[PDB]
Design a protein around this ligand. Structure first.
Ligand SMILES: Cc1cc2nc3c(=O)[nH]c(=O)nc-3n(C[C@H](O)[C@H](O)[C@H](O)COP(=O)(O)OP(=O)(O)OC[C@H]3O[C@@H](n4cnc5c(N)ncnc54)[C@H](O)[C@@H]3O)c2cc1C
Ligand SMILES: Cc1cc2nc3c(=O)[nH]c(=O)nc-3n(C[C@H](O)[C@H](O)[C@H](O)COP(=O)(O)OP(=O)(O)OC[C@H]3O[C@@H](n4cnc5c(N)ncnc54)[C@H](O)[C@@H]3O)c2cc1C
Lengths: 333, 330
């Protein structure tokens, strides 16, 4: 049972960012991550994925992302970056470890792994991301649909959908990008809640970051899809049928497959039992967005806007990582 | 959407055995497996694990296990075997693929992967093993125990248990072996339902095939260190330990469940094949499913053939299953 000052849970961009700042502190720490390789959830993104901002705009603290081959970073490059980042700062990343549970051990916290390894931490920084909690909504008659379903989290390639009629549900960047790729081999139908909003052709995802005083980027395959005229959105249906869907007015479309691009929740099963997870799947944090209210020794990092505006982006996590790390450095004194 | 005659789900020793025979049939087939590497659930066994029979007695069809360095095969050798086995027979193993669902598509079956890939099969041989469905029983007050728990499926090394009081629950070969290893660094207590029965010192796991727990070297050792005393189940758990019928209390820092597994058949839910006992209802041969004739099952344990869930004993059922389906495809 190692005693450390800080345990960081999750070894993605968020955890590596926390790491960079903890290195410059005087504190003893470790970073626990469940994956086989470095790179967080990017290891699970689909093959064609590219970022929506250039390398300079996709960089975490200190060492920036190397310039990419094309205008936008490819999935591969993001992995290469995050790999080389750990080495560059020789960060204490133990991998693979699945943290099962964090629980009270007197004044400190006890972090337990699936295989019985244990750590004793004065502080914990949860940086586990969202990929692990894919969200599918509940629609009437869904349990009856005979076709194929998957979440965007497991989308990989358009091939399997060749020649099918396919519903893409969700109107974010993901929906748009996957719609773009699947429309190349399938009769496609984009189902969105509100009619989608595209940024301008001459601008990129850095814009979403610039709203940090407090929608979807025209990345090349999206430009292409627009030009092929497949970016028409339709409102949600009313019911699912065994073979398709049905709308308010009674119009019926058949589908062979459905791809849920309906987002994710924070992956905080390891904090259940500390009673920190709200029924909305978040935690209640202080005004800085970072520190948990019900248990002062737990900080959270990188999860999304409730945990800091644009914290769930490469560029935007840096600020909160700094703040979280100086906050805990104070706590350890 | 590939049409094949037979889809084998699971690329462990069971699936490779089904594979060996399907190769000698004239049939088109494929083997889908979820893991990163070959070797099935042996990739997940703990570091010190050795088999309880020699190599000759741990072999699947055709090409036998190479002789091992020591008297019993080590985890590493088992993986090496199963790796080379696939190359030797150039078996059609697609990996990694997670089969989500098998469902009716007219006369045939439709096998669907998590990422949308699809196959159209006249027949399906489920060989997904048990590792994926670890079983922990439900004891009173368990939710309250403050210490550490894991199933044997995630046991790895004794180090984390150094200096603790530790309960080992389950009295199989696993319990015994894990007890043997963890007793080297921890005050240990073996909790079993039935007082455990050891085979004789001069015999090994081949005996179990000739139809309880084998005296493999670390177990001999543990016997000699006097740590193989079993105790009956407790009555309830406390936050810091357990309590027996008579009211005696022992404290524990950790608990390791060696209480077995169920068959991993989530992919057959929805065909309504999975009994509430976690099995499926099969014909007299033990292999073919009753409620859906196009589904065979292989390697899952005694209900699916005596000693089917062993390296040596799966061979027979693989052959039988494969000749059964070869008949069905005609
Ligand atoms: C399709 C898609 C496109 C995106 N595009 C962009 C983009 O173009 N630009 C951009 O800035 N952002 C983008 N993001 C968002 C954000 O950059 C990613 O979500 C990124 O994955 C978040 O990094 P993270 O560390 O917060 O989460 P992750 O990278 O998911 O998480 C890090 C790690 O924590 C580990 N973990 C979780 N639980 C445990 C546990 N119990 N024990 C140990 N380890 C654990 C996980 O396995 C994972 O390795 C995109 C996201 C998606 C889904
Ligand atoms: C601790 C322990 C010790 C043992 N010791 C011995 C011994 O000494 N001698 C002996 O003969 N036997 C022993 N066995 C038993 C048996 O030999 C092994 O259990 C073996 O792993 C069973 O072979 P299998 O192929 O049926 O299962 P596995 O090897 O677990 O299964 C093969 C594959 O099915 C895959 N799979 C599951 N679901 C899906 C899906 N939905 N889609 C795609 N792929 C899937 C799994 O990923 C897995 O790789 C032992 C078992 C255990 C647990």
């Amino acid at each position: 049972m190692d005693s450390v000052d800080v345990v960081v849970i999750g070894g993605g961009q968020s955890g590596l960012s926390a790491g960079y700042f903890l290195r410059r502190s005087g504190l003893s720490y470790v970073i626990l991550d469940a994956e086989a390789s470095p790179g967080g959830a990017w290891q699970h993104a689909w093959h064609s994925l590219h970022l929506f901002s250039p390398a300079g705009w996709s960089s975490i603290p200190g060492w920036p992302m190397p310039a990419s081959q094309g205008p936008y970073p490819a999935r591969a490059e993001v992995l290469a970056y995050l790999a080389q980042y750990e080495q560059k700062y020789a960060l204490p990343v133990l991998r693979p470890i699945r943290v099962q549970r964090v629980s009270h051990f007197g004044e400190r916290l006890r972090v337990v792994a699936r295989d019985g390894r244990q750590w004793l931490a004065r502080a914990v920084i949860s940086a586990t991301g969202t990929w692990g909690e894919a969200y599918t909504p509940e629609y009437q008659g869904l349990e009856s649909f005979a076709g194929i379903q998957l979440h965007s989290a497991h989308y990989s390639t358009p091939a399997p959908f060749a020649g099918m009629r396919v519903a893409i549900i969700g109107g974010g960047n993901s929906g748009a990008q996957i719609l773009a790729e699947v429309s190349t081999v399938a009769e496609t139908t984009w189902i969105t809640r509100t009619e989608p909003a595209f940024l301008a052709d001459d601008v990129d995802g850095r814009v979403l970051f610039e709203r940090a005083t407090e929608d979807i980027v025209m990345v090349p395959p999206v430009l292409d899809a627009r030009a092929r005229g497949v970016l028409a959105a339709v409102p949600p249906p009313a019911r699912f049928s065994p073979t398709g869907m049905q709308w308010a007015d009674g119009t019926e479309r058949a589908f062979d497959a459905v791809i849920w691009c309906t987002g994710f929740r924070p992956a905080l099963s390891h904090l259940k039992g500390l009673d920190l997870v709200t029924p909305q799947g978040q935690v209640e944090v202080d005004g800085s967005g970072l520190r948990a209210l019900a248990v002062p020794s737990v900080w959270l990092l990188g999860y999304g806007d409730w945990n800091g505006m644009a914290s769930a982006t490469l560029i935007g996590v840096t600020r909160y990582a700094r703040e979280a790390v100086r906050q805990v450095t104070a706590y350890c004194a």
